RNA sequence: UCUU
């Protein structure tokens, strides 16, 4: 299957493939990283694992917006 | 929060 993962404007402090790697890598069947120097994208296999990784890593306490991750479950390439 |  196919899925893509969008990062919010948090990593506007310089960023590397390794920032999105630390976020998501031990999830799903994987595909590729498309890091961009303002905020990156990921494109991975298994969208349900990408969505389970959002609620794992982007988990939030009542202290405002500290993490922003969003799935686009486009099963198309 | 949808792509130097």
UniProtKB/Swiss-Prot annotation:
Coiled coil: none annotated. It comes from the Eukaryota. Signal peptide: none annotated. Residues 3-74 form the RRM domain. It is found in: Nucleus, Nucleoplasm. May be required for packaging pre-mRNAs into ribonucleoprotein structures amenable to efficient nuclear RNA processing. Binds to poly(A)+ RNA. Appears to act in the maintenance of CLN3 mRNA levels. Present with 5830 molecules/cell in log phase SD medium. This is Nuclear polyadenylated RNA-binding protein 3.
